[PDB]
Amino acid sequence: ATVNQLVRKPRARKVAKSNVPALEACPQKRGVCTRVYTTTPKKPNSALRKVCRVRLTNGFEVTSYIGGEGHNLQEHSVILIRGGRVKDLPGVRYHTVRGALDCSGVKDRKQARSKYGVKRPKA
Amino acid sequence: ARYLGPKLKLSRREGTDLFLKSGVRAIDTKCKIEQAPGQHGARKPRLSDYGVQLREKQKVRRIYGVLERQFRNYYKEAARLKGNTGENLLALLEGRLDNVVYRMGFGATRAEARQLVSHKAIMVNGRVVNIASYQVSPNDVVSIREKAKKQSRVKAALELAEQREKPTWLEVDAGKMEGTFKRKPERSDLSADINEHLIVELYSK
């Protein structure tokens, strides 16, 4: 571009929007939820994967992946909700935190207990 | 703090001895050098360009027995000083108190040297000094104090100390359990094992 033009109208940075409407400089939010489905992914993969409609405390209805092997979650249940997209499913940008609030940890899991909410085995 | 684990595994992983055990004898039988530890170490490594940098960082760090955060602090000080950064790095590491005790030969090993400075045996210019990381100055006398004097710990060490090739930057003394640190190490004085541009290169990315 020409230097007189840049004096006249300057350069302008991109908006750089976030991936999560949960936002608000928050890592964690809360919600009361409603419905737990098991929906198919996109055709390159196959499975039935556990997904929940979380009504957030700030009034936003969003959808969220349930990790780990099974869960206790149903109906009205208060869970913790962190970020992170799952690309194989449609539009899920969030994950529920296992072993928090109303959520069970994954029983009989032994490795990687930083995820899945499992206190260390003692014998 | 401290590594605490099995000493020989680090030498066997790095593929050149780190002198961690090495008291009574420099024994081949225990070491099993260049065979690698664990089940699948028999195979040829075919190491990457990132890995040869990362290996050399661990090789230097495991000699002096430092952890990455403390080791990073020496790199930051060595960088701001004029002249070569790798040399100013190795100068600060060699300038450690637990290191000078190993160089004078009061202790058998670097871990026993760190034990003696922690256990308040060692005094520098008549101060007692707990801290292993302590930076020794030019013109610093160093000595063992009366409680730790003439025990089985120091006495066995002073015997096996004679075998060593003997540093060029300090006066050994040690007829009465003391030593004197005369002047700075320089690149010629210290060992040829380290690749000095290489360890500095890894922190650049």
Binding site: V36, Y37, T38, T40, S46 | -
Partner: protein, 71 residues
């Protein structure tokens, strides 16, 4: 590791939707949305309504079947 709490039971295929998705009426259960299994796609097999298939159902979501067994 996997646990064997999934249930397999039969049903008549009522109607074929898009995407290899089928409306199958079970014998005891209601009519459920069933996707075809991987194996049929793998061996290039297509199916048709009015036929009686074994349909794996999960306790978590009882509205989603899985057409396991052949025509």
């Amino acid at each position: 590791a996997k646990e064997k709490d999934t249930i397999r039971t039969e049903g008549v295929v009522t109607e074929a939707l898009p995407n290899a998705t089928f409306r199958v009426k079970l014998d005891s259960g209601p009519e459920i949305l069933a996707y075809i299994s991987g194996k049929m796609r793998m061996h290039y097999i297509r199916i048709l309504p009015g036929d009686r298939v074994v349909v794996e159902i999960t306790p978590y979501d009882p509205t989603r079947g899985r057409i396991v067994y052949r025509k």
